[PDB]
Write a protein that binds this ligand. Structure first.
Ligand SMILES: [Mg+2]
Ligand SMILES: [Zn+2]
Ligand SMILES: [Zn+2]
Lengths: 50, 1202, 468
C-alpha cells in the first residue's frame, strides 16, 4: 500500500486508515520519541502539521 | 503567534461572549428537506451556512453577497468551515453544579466552603436546606435545616433569615464568601495550631483560597448558569451510504439537557407543586453532569444500543482521547507499507523500494518534473501520463528518487534505530528489500514482517534524514556504545568456516607470496580453505598518536585467513584475523576498525565482511541431517544408573530411613547431575574427531559437525539447544512452579511420548503467555520513563559546578563485577585525578576519558575517581555537555540540543522484553566492613562484617580463611515503599529503651544536645541496637529492605543515586544487558525535582509546601543577592508517575494521564503554560526545542528577553 | 443513602396519603369555592360587566363565536339570550343605584349582591377570565409600586394614621405641607415628585371609581381565593402522583427515560385537575388517565427522536406497524408493500415513503469488528473538501487566462474581465460595462464577440484547450 494524498477524516481532518480507504500509515507516539531522540525537528513538524 | 496557553474558570459573561446564539430547541434537521431548523442544535443562523457562500432560503448565493446577513432567514453568507468554530449557549432555568469541581476528589467546592461532600450532595439533590443569610438570628451560615426544621424556624423568625435548597444555595454561599478575610483567619489559626492533621487541612484550604484570589477567578463560577454548546461539525449528523444517518452521542446529551431545561421553564409558568419542580431541577443537574462526564455521578446513561453515551470528558481523555490518538500521534500522508524481503546485494545506505510504491509516494514530484521539462502542459496531462504509466514517467521517477532519502520504520519502535533513512533503489516487485546488517536494529526477521516508508518533503527534512537518521551514521548503540551492525547468522557462519583449521588438508606447508596467491591456490584447487601454510603479510599499524608503521613478515596461517585479510582495511593487526572467527571475533574486528580508522572505512569493511561471509557460507554447503545429532552411548547407561539408584532410594523411603521431602530433593539432585553428565558426554563426543596427519599418526581435531559449527560460531544455538537435541530434555516444571520428579529421558531425535509432550506443553504455554503480558508491562514502563524524562535536553556547555560523584569498580564478593574502565569511559573528570601515593596531577579537570586515558588509568592502578554526572549539574533547565559527557551513539562530546532524556528512557525500556569468609586473593586487610586489597593498591575483595584471622593492616595470602526482573525495575523507578521496610536511625545519638506500651513498643534516643527523640517500633522486630551505644545517622536498627525515601532523607543525594543505579543494573546485568549509568542518572535527576520548605523565611513560600527545586534555587540566589534570609528545604524522591503528573506544564500532565484531575486543578489555580518542553510543542505543531529546532527556540528566548 | 433520582422521587411522593371518593368531592368543592370567590371579586369592578355586555352584543349579532363568550351555566342561544338580557337588566338596576341614590344607600348594595348572585351562575372561558384578572392585577401592582415609592421617599406614623382614607387624597399633601418637623424640609422638596406620583394615581382612581379601600378589599379577596384554589389543586395532584407513575410505567424504552415520562404525566395531571368536574359523578382517576395518556404520547412523539417526525406521520408509522403486524400474523410472512398499501387504502408510493422516512441515526461510536479501538466514526470522510489537484488546476487556469487576456488589446480584455468577473468581486451585465466609457449595449456585445472569436483562433488557444 502507498498513498500521497487522499481522503481525510470529517472531524479530525486527518488521513484515514486502512487499505480499503486508501489511508495513511500512523506515526504513533513511539515514532515521535524516536524523531525527538534523533533531533529531527523539521521532519517531526512535517509529520505533525503539513 | 502565541507564546502561552492560559487556563481558568469560565464566567457566564465569557461563555456568552463565545456564543453566536442561544439554542432554544432540541431540533436537529428536517425529516424531508434535511435542512437545519431555526434555534436548533444545527441552526444555520447560530453556527453558519451549510453551503459555501449560500443562505438557507437561497436568495444570496454568491461571493458578491459575502458578509451580508439575509433578512428572510438570517444566515450569514460566508464559508461553511465556520461551523467548526462557532459555538452556542443554553441559558439554564436553574443553576447547575459542575461535576468536575464537585466530584473530582478533593472537591474544590467542599474545600472552599469547608463542608463535607455528602452534605453538599444532600443540598444539591434537594434533601436538606442550608442557611444563606443568617441575619439577626442564632442560625449560622452553612448549617443544615431539614424541611420540618425549616418550617418551624420559618414560623419562629420569618423573613429575618434566608434558607435555600439546591445549587442556588451553594451559589449564594460561594458568592457570599469574603476570601481575604478567610485567608487571614486560616493564617492566624495556623500560627496558633498544634495538630498536624489540622495543619494539613488548613494548608490545603489556604492554598485553594490564595490560588482563587491570585488567579482572579470567582468561586461562584463553579456553578453553571449558562452552558456552552459545541460547534456542530465537531458533533456531526451525516448521511451514510444506504440512506442511514450517523450521529454523535453529544447530540443526544444536548437534546436531553435542552428538553429538561424547557420542561423546567414550562413548569415554572404553569405553577406546579414544589415536588415536581424539585424533581425537574434534579433532572437538569443529572443531565448536565452526564453531558460533561458520564458515569461519574452514578449510573451512566445509555443509548438505544445499550452502551454508555460518550461525554466530552471521554472525548478529551484516555488512550482513545484527543491527546494521545490525534495530537501526540497521527496518520500521515506520503506514507506506505509493505512486506520486507532481504537484499544481500545492497549497500548499508541503500534500500530496495518497489516501483509502484515509489510512483504513488513521489507523485507530486513527478508532476513537477514533467511540467518543468515540458512533456506535460497542465497537471491533468501529467496525471494522465502517470496513470498510463509511460516510459518517460519511469525515467522521471528515477531522477526524482535519485538522491531523495526515505524513512523506513518497523513497529514496535522501541528505540530510535527503529526508524532510519536509506537511499532508495527502484526494484520490480511489491516487497521492500532491507539490508541484513540493519535487521538487528529493527528486530526484523523475514517471516511476514511489514515495514512503513515515509517520504521527507522539505529540504530541512531531507538533510536531517541524510545527516542524522541515515543508516551509515547510526552504527553504534546509544544505550551502550557498542556497534549495532555486527554480523549474524550466515555471515558469521561463513567467516567461521573460512577461518577454521584442518590437519592434513590439501596444500599443507606451502609458501605463498600473499593473500592474492592464497586466492589463486584456492580457485585453482591446489589448496583447501583450511590448509596450514606460510604467507607473506604486509601489515600497517596506526598508533594512538597517528604513527603509521608498515612492515612485512612471514606468518603461519591458513589460506582462508589470508583470503579474508584481502578485505581488511589498512591499519589493523593481522592477529585479529589469524584465528577462527566467531561472532565475538567479528564484533571485535568491527569495533577495532571503528576505534582506529573511523566511520567510512568501518562501513566499507562491514559491507565486504557481509558479502564474503554470505559467499563462503554458500560455498561451504553446511546442512543439517539426522546423522548430525549424535546421541552419546553413555546416556543410556547413565539413565539406567539413575533409575537403579532411584529404585534404591525408593526402597530406603519404604523403610522409613528418609522422609518424603528429603527423597524429593535428592531425586531432583540426582536427575540434575545425570542431565549435566549426559550433556557433558554429548559435548565431548560432538566437539572432537581423530584425523591422520602427514607423518601418519593420529591427531585430535576440533569437529566439523554442522550443529557443532552452528553452536560454536555463535550464529544460532547455544549449549542448551544441542543438549535438548542430542542429550536429555531434563526436568520440567508443573504449571504452579513445582518440578516433576521424573524428567524427560528423551531428546528430540528419538522423540517424546504422550506424557513427555504434555509436560512440555505445560511450560511452553507458560512461556508464551508470560511473553505476551511482559510485552505490555515493558511498554507501559517505557512510556512512563519517556514522560518523566522528556524535558531533559543539553542546554549548556559547562554549568560551573564543583560537585561530582565518586566512582569505583563494582565488587559483590571476591571478584569484580565490572571494571572502572567500563564505568569511566566517556565521563568528564570532576576532581583532579592524583596518582596514588603521589601529588602529581595525572589527569586535569574537564577532560573526556576516552580509550587512551582509560588505558592510562588502568596502567597506573587508580581505584577511586570523581566525575561529573547529570544529577549534580546546576543548570536551571536541562543539563550541560560536560556533566553528561560522551554521547554513546556518536563517540564525541554530546552536542547542544540532544534530547538525552528520551535517549535514556528508550535505552532503559528497550531491553524490557528480555527481562524476566576465605580470601581468594593476596593482599592486605582493611576495616571500615572488610576489604582485601592487592599489593598494587586496588580494592579487590569487599565482604560484610557481621556483629577474624588477621587484624587491620595484616597481609593475607591466597586461600587463607579470614572468617522478578521487570517488576523490580518498575517498583524501583516509582520509589515504592517495601512491605516490611528497614527501621533506620532518625538521628545520631545514644539509644535507650522505653515503656513497652500495649500493642507495639517504643524506644528513645538522646542526641548530642540532650533532646529525646521517640521512635515507634512494632513488636515483631529483631532490634540490632543496644542501649548505651551512639548509633550514627544512616545506621540500621531493624534489618530489611531499604526504602529509597529514607535513604535520601538520612544519607543524601549520592546515596539514593547509587542505590537506584546499583539495583537496576544488578537486574539488567543478571540477564546480560549492558546499559550505561548516565541514562539511569538522568532518570534519577528527574526524580529529584521537588522540595518541601521547612523554614518559610521571607520568600513567598509556605512551610510544608511541595514546590519545584529550580524555582527555589533561583529565588534563593536572588535573595542572597539581596542579602535576605533564604529558605530551608528538604528534597523529595518522587516516582516517575508522580513526578510526571506534577510537572509545571499542565498540557504535558494532561496528555500523560489523569486528565480530569490535572485540568480541574489547572483551571482552579489559573495556571499558565509556557510551552517549554517537547510534548507541548508537539501538540501545538511547533518545532521541538531539541536538536535542529533548538537554536530556533533560543532565538525566541532572546526576543522575549528584549 | 441513594443517588438515583428515581428512588428519591418515590420517597417524596410516597409521603402523601391516598384519597377516597369523599376526598375528591371535598377537594373539588374547595376548588370551586376559590373559583367563585375570584369570580365575585372580578364582578365588583365597574368595567368588568360592560365588557361581558359588549361581548354578548357582538355575539348575539351572529358575528362572534358563542363558545368564546361563555362555557357553561350554573344550575342549582335559547337560554343564553334570556339570561344575558336579564343580566343586562340587573346591571342596569345596579347602574341606576350606583350614585344617584347614594353609594352607601341600600339600593347600591342590594343590587350589588344580587348582581353578584346572577354572575355566580356563569361559567366563562378561562381566556378572558385571566384577561380581567390580569388587568386588575396590573392596576393593583401599579398602586403598590407607587405606594412603595412614596414610602421610600418619605423615609411614617402620620402616613399610617392617614393611610386608611387619605392615602391618595390631597388632604394628606396639604397636611404634610403644613407640617414643620425638622425632616419635613427635604420631604417638602420630595413633595414635588410625590405630586407627580399622586397625579399618576388620579386617572387610575377615576378609571376605577373605587378610591383605595375598595380596590384593596377586592385584591385581598382575589388573593385569598386564588391561594385556596391553588392549595386544593396541589393537594389533588400530590395525591394522584402514584397514578401518574403507574400509567407512565407502560411506555418505557421508547427513546425517553422513565423520569421524563413521569414529568410529562405530571403535567397531564395538572391540566386534568384544571378542568375536572364532579357534578358528572365519575371518579377522578378515569378522567386523569386520559390526559396523562395524552401527555406521555405527545411528549414521546415530539422528543424521542433526533430527527423529529411530525405527529401525523408518527401515527401513520405506528398504524403501518400494526397493520403489518396483523398481516404477518395472519399469513405467516413479512407482508410486501403492495399488500400493505392495499390494506391501508393508500398509494404504494406513500407506503414506501413512510417505510424509508427516518430510522434513528446510528452512533459514531458503534464498535466495528472485535476491537475496542474501532468505531464507525473513524471511517467517515469529508466529502466537502477540494482535492489539491483541483486547486492546482484552478491556479494554473488563473495564470493561463491572465496570459491570454494580456495577449489582447486592453479595452476588450477589460470588457471581458468586467463581463465575466475575473479578478473582481462581482459579475457585471452589459449596462455597467457600458457605464465604463460609453453607455451603449450593442457595441459592448460586438466587442465581446470579436474578442471571443479572436481568442478562439487556434494560435492563442492551445494553452486553454488543455483544460477540457
Ligand atoms: Mg518476524
Ligand atoms: Zn436567506
Ligand atoms: Zn553541568
Amino acid at each position: 500500500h502507498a498513498r500521497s494524498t487522499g481522503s481525510y477524516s470529517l472531524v479530525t481532518q486527518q488521513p484515514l486508515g486502512g487499505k480499503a480507504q486508501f489511508g495513511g500509515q500512523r506515526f504513533g507516539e513511539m515514532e515521535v520519541w524516536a524523531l525527538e531522540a534523533y533531533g529531527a525537528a523539521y521532519t517531526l513538524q512535517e509529520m505533525l502539521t503539513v | 503567534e502565541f507564546d502561552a496557553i492560559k487556563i481558568g474558570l469560565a464566567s457566564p459573561d465569557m461563555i456568552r461572549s463565545w456564543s453566536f446564539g442561544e439554542v432554544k430547541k432540541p431540533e436537529t434537521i428536517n425529516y424531508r428537506t434535511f435542512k437545519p431548523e431555526r434555534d436548533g442544535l444545527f441552526c444555520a443562523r447560530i453556527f453558519g451556512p451549510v453551503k459555501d457562500y449560500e443562505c438557507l432560503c437561497g436568495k444570496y448565493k454568491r461571493l458578491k453577497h459575502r458578509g451580508v446577513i439575509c433578512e428572510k432567514c438570517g444566515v450569514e453568507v460566508t464559508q461553511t468551515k465556520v461551523r467548526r468554530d462557532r459555538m452556542g449557549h443554553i441559558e439554564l432555568a436553574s443553576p447547575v453544579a459542575h461535576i468536575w469541581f464537585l466530584k473530582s476528589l478533593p472537591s474544590r467546592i467542599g474545600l472552599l466552603m469547608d463542608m463535607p461532600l455528602r452534605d453538599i450532595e444532600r443540598v444539591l439533590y434537594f434533601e436538606m436546606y442550608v442557611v444563606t443569610e443568617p441575619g439577626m438570628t442564632d442560625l449560622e451560615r452553612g448549617q443544615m435545616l431539614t424541611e420540618e426544621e425549616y418550617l418551624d424556624r420559618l414560623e419562629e423568625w420569618g423573613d429575618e433569615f434566608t434558607a435555600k435548597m439546591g445549587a442556588e444555595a451553594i451559589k449564594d454561599l460561594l458568592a457570599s464568601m469574603d476570601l481575604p478575610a478567610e485567608a487571614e483567619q486560616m493564617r492566624e489559626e495556623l500560627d496558633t495550631t498544634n495538630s498536624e492533621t489540622k495543619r494539613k487541612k488548613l494548608t490545603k484550604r489556604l492554598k485553594l483560597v490564595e490560588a482563587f484570589v491570585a488567579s482572579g477567578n470567582k468561586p461562584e463560577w463553579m456553578i453553571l448558569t449558562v452552558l456552552p454548546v459545541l460547534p456542530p461539525d465537531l458533533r456531526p449528523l451525516v448521511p451514510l451510504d444506504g440512506g442511514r444517518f450517523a450521529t454523535s452521542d453529544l447530540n443526544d446529551l444536548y437534546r436531553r439537557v435542552i428538553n429538561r431545561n424547557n420542561r423546567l421553564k414550562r413548569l415554572l409558568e404553569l405553577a406546579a407543586p414544589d415536588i415536581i419542580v424539585r424533581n425537574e431541577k434534579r433532572m437538569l443537574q443529572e443531565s448536565v453532569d452526564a453531558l460533561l462526564d458520564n458515569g461519574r455521578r452514578g449510573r451512566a446513561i445509555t443509548g438505544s444500543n445499550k452502551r454508555p453515551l460518550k461525554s466530552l470528558a471521554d472525548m478529551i481523555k484516555g488512550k482513545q482521547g484527543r491527546f494521545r490518538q490525534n495530537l501526540l500521534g497521527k496518520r500521515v500522508d506520503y506514507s506506505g507499507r509493505s512486506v520486507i524481503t532481504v537484499g544481500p546485494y545492497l549497500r548499508l545506505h541503500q534500500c530496495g523500494l518497489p516501483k509502484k510504491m515509489a510512483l504513488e509516494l513521489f507523485k507530486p514530484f513527478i508532476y513537477s518534473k514533467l511540467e518543468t521539462r515540458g512533456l506535460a502542459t497542465t497537471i491533468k496531462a501529467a496525471k494522465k501520463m502517470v496513470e498510463r504509466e509511460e516510459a518517460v514517467v519511469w525515467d522521471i521517477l528515477d531522477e526524482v528518487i535519485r538522491e531523495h532519502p526515505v524513512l523506513l520504520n518497523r513497529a514496535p519502535t522501541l528505540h530510535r534505530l527503529g526508524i532510519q533513512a536509506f537511499e532508495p533503489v527502484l526494484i520490480e516487485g511489491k516487497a521492500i528489500q532491507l539490508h541484513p546488517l540493519v535487521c538487528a536494529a529493527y528486530n526484523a526477521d523475514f517471516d511476514g514482517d511489514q515495514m512503513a516508508v515515509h517520504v521527507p518533503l522539505t529540504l530541512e527534512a531531507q538533510l536531517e534524514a541524510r545527516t542524522l537518521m541515515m543508516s551509515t551514521n547510526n552504527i553504534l548503540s546509544p544505550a551502550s556504545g557498542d556497534p549495532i551492525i555486527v554480523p549474524s547468522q550466515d555471515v558469521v557462519l561463513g567467516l567461521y568456516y573460512m577461518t577454521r583449521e584442518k590437519i592434513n588438508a590439501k596444500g599443507e606447508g606451502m609458501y605463498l607470496t600473499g593473500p592474492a596467491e592464497a586466492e589463486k591456490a584456492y580457485r585453482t584447487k591446489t589448496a583447501e580453505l583450511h590448509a596450514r601454510v606460510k604467507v607473506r603479510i604486509t601489515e600497517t599499524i596506526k598508533h594512538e598518536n597517528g604513527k603509521l608503521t608498515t612492515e612485512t613478515k612471514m606468518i603461519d596461517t591458513t589460506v582462508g585467513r589470508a583470503m579474508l585479510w584481502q578485505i581488511v582495511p589498512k591499519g589493523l593487526p593481522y592477529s585479529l584475523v589469524n584465528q577462527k572467527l566467531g561472532k565475538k571475533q567479528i564484533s571485535n574486528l568491527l569495533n577495532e576498525a571503528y576505534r582506529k580508522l573511523g566511520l567510512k572505512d568501518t562501513v566499507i569493511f562491514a559491507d565486504q565482511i557481509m558479502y564474503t561471509g554470505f559467499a563462503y557460507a554458500a560455498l561451504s554447503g553446511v546442512s543439517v541431517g539426522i546423522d548430525d545429532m549424535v546421541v552419546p552411548a553413555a546416556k543410556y547407561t547413565e539413565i539406567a544408573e539413575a533409575e537403579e539408584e532411584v529404585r534404591e532410594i525408593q526402597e530406603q523411603f519404604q523403610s522409613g530411613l528418609v522422609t518424603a521431602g528429603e527423597r524429593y530433593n535428592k531425586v531432583i539432585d540426582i536427575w540434575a547431575s545425570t542431565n549435566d553428565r549426559v550433556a557433558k558426554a554429548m559435548m565431548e563426543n560432538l566437539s572432537s574427531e581423530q584425523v591422520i596427519n602427514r607423518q601418519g599418526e593420529q591427531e585430535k581435531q576440533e569437529s566439523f559437525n554442522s550443529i557443532y559449527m552452528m553452536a560454536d560460531s555463535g550464529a544460532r544455538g547455544s549449549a542448551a539447544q544441542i543438549r535438548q537435541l542430542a542429550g536429555m530434555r531434563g526436568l520440567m516444571a508443573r504449571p504452579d512452579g513445582s518440578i516433576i520428579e521424573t524428567p524427560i529421558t528423551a531428546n528430540f531425535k528419538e522423540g517424546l511420548n504422550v506424557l513427555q509432550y504434555f509436560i512440555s506443553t505445560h511450560g511452553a504455554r507458560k512461556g508464551l503467555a508470560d511473553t505476551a503480558l511482559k510485552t505490555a508491562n515493558s511498554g507501559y514502563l517505557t512510556r512512563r520513563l519517556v514522560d518523566v524524562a522528556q524535558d531533559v535536553v543539553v542546554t549548556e556547555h559547562d554549568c560551573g559546578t564543583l560537585e561530582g560523584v565518586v566512582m569505583t569498580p563494582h565488587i559483590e564478593g571476591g571478584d569484580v563485577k565490572v571494571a572502572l574502565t567500563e564505568l569511566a569511559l566517556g565521563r568528564v573528570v570532576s576532581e583532579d585525578i592524583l596518582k596514588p601515593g603521589t601529588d602529581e596531577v595525572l589527569i586535569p579537570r574537564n577532560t573526556l576519558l576516552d580509550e587512551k586515558w582509560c588505558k592510562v588509568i588502568n596502567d597506573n592502578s587508580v581505584d577511586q575517581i570523581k566525575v561529573r554526572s547529570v544529577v549534580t549539574c546546576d543548570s536551571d533547565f536541562g543539563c550541560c555537555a560536560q556533566c553528561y559527557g560522551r554521547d554513546l551513539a556518536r563517540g564525541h562530546l554530546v552536542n547542544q540540543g540532544e534530547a538525552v532524556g528520551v535517549i535514556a528512557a528508550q535505552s532503559i525500556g528497550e531491553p524490557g522484553t528480555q527481562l524476566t569468609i576465605q580470601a581468594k586473593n593476596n593482599g592486605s586487610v582493611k576495616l571500615h566492613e572488610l576489604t582485601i586489597i592487592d599489593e598494587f593498591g586496588r580494592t579487590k575483595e569487599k565482604h560484610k562484617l557481621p556483629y577474624l584471622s588477621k587484624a587491620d593492616g595484616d597481609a593475607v595470602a591466597a586461600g587463607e580463611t579470614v572468617a522478578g526482573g521487570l517488576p523490580r525495575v518498575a517498583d524501583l523507578f516509582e520509589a515504592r515503599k517495601p512491605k516490611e521496610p528497614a527501621i533506620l536511625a532518625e538521628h545520631s545519638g545514644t539509644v535507650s529503651f522505653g515503656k513497652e506500651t500495649k500493642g507495639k513498643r517504643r524506644l528513645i534516643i538522646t542526641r548530642d544536645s540532650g533532646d529525646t527523640y521517640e521512635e515507634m517500633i512494632p513488636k515483631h522486630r529483631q532490634l540490632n541496637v543496644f542501649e548505651g551505644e551512639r548509633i550514627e545517622r544512616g545506621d540500621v536498627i531493624a534489618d530489611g529492605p531499604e526504602s529509597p525515601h529514607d535513604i535520601l532523607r538520612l544519607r543524601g543525594i549520592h546515596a539514593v543515586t547509587t542505590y537506584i543505579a546499583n539495583e537496576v543494573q544488578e537486574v539488567y546485568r543478571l540477564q546480560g544487558v549492558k546499559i550505561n549509568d548516565k541514562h539511569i542518572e538522568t532518570i534519577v535527576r528527574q526524580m529529584l525535582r521537588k522540595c518541601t520548605i521547612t523554614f518559610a523565611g521571607d520568600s513567598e513560600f509556605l512551610p510544608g509546601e511541595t514546590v519545584e527545586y529550580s524555582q527555589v534555587k533561583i529565588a534563593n540566589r536572588k535573595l542572597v543577592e539581596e542579602g535576605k534570609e533564604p529558605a530551608r528545604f528538604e528534597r523529595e524522591l518522587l516516582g516517575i508517575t508522580k513526578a510526571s503528573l506534577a510537572t509545571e506544564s499542565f498540557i504535558s500532565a494532561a496528555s500523560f494521564q489523569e486528565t480530569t484531575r490535572v485540568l480541574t486543578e489547572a483551571a482552579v489555580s489559573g495556571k499558565r503554560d509556557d510551552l517549554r518542553g517537547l510534548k507541548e510543542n508537539v501538540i501545538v505543531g511547533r518545532l521541538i526545542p531539541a536538536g535542529t529546532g533548538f537554536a530556533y527556540h533560543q532565538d525566541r528566548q532572546a526576543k522575549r528577553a528584549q | 443513602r441513594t443517588t438515583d433520582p428515581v428512588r428519591m422521587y418515590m420517597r417524596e411522593m410516597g409521603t402523601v396519603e391516598l384519597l377516597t371518593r369523599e376526598g375528591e368531592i371535598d377537594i373539588a368543592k374547595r376548588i370551586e369555592d376559590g373559583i367563585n370567590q375570584v369570580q365575585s371579586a372580578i364582578a365588583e369592578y365597574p368595567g368588568t360587566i360592560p365588557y361581558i355586555l359588549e361581548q354578548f352584543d357582538r355575539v348575539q349579532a351572529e358575528e362572534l363565536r358563542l363558545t368564546d363568550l361563555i362555557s357553561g351555566f350554573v344550575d342549582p342561544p335559547e337560554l343564553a339570550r334570556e339570561k344575558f338580557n336579564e343580566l343586562r337588566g340587573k346591571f342596569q338596576n345596579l347602574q341606576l343605584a350606583v350614585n344617584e341614590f347614594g353609594r352607601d344607600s341600600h339600593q347600591a348594595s342590594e343590587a350589588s349582591d344580587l348582581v353578584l348572585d346572577i354572575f355566580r351562575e356563569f361559567r366563562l372561558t378561562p381566556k378572558q377570565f385571566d384577561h380581567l384578572v390580569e388587568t386588575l392585577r396590573t392596576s393593583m401592582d401599579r398602586v403598590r409600586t407607587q405606594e412603595r415609592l412614596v414610602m421610600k421617599a418619605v423615609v411614617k406614623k402620620s402616613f399610617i394614621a392617614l393611610f386608611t382614607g387619605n392615602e391618595s387624597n390631597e388632604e394628606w399633601l396639604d397636611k404634610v405641607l403644613a407640617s414643620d418637623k425638622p425632616y419635613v424640609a427635604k420631604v417638602r422638596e420630595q413633595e414635588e415628585e410625590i405630586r407627580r406620583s399622586i397625579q399618576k394615581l388620579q386617572m387610575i382612581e377615576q378609571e376605577t371609581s373605587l378610591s383605595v379601600e375598595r380596590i384593596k378589599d377586592i385584591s385581598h379577596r382575589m388573593s385569598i381565593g386564588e391561594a385556596k384554589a391553588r392549595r386544593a389543586k396541589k393537594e389533588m395532584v400530590e395525591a394522584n402522583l402514584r397514578l401518574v407513575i403507574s400509567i407512565a410505567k407502560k411506555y418505557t424504552n421508547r427513546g425517553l427515560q422513565f423520569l421524563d415520562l413521569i414529568q410529562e404525566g405530571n403535567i397531564g395531571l395538572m391540566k386534568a385537575v384544571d378542568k375536572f368536574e364532579y357534578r358528572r359523578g365519575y371518579k377522578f382517576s378515569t378522567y386523569a388517565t386520559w390526559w396523562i395518556r395524552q401527555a406521555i404520547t405527545r411528549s414521546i412523539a415530539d422528543q424521542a427522536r433526533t430527527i423529529r417526525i411530525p405527529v401525523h406521520m408518527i401515527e401513520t408509522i405506528n398504524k403501518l406497524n400494526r397493520i403489518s403486524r396483523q398481516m404477518l400474523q395472519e399469513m405467516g410472512r413479512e407482508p410486501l408493500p403492495e399488500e400493505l398499501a392495499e390494506r391501508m387504502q393508500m398509494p404504494e408510493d406513500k407506503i414506501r415513503k413512510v417505510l424509508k422516512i427516518a430510522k434513528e441515526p446510528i452512533s459514531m461510536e458503534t464498535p466495528i469488528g472485535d476491537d475496542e479501538d474501532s468505531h464507525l466514526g473513524d471511517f467517515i470522510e469529508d466529502t466537502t473538501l477540494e482535492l489539491p489537484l483541483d486547486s492546482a488546476t484552478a491556479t494554473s487556469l488563473k495564470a493561463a487566462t491572465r496570459d491570454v487576456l494580456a495577449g489582447l488589446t486592453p479595452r476588450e480584455a477589460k470588457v471581458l474581465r468586467m463581463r465575466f468577473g475575473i479578478d473582481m468581486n462581482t459579475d457585471h451585465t452589459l449596462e455597467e460595462v457600458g457605464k465604463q466609457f460609453d453607455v451603449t449595449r450593442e457595441r459592448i456585445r460586438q466587442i465581446e464577440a470579436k474578442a471571443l472569436r479572436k481568442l478562439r483562433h487556434p494560435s492563442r488557444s492551445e494553452v486553454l484547450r488543455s483544460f477540457l
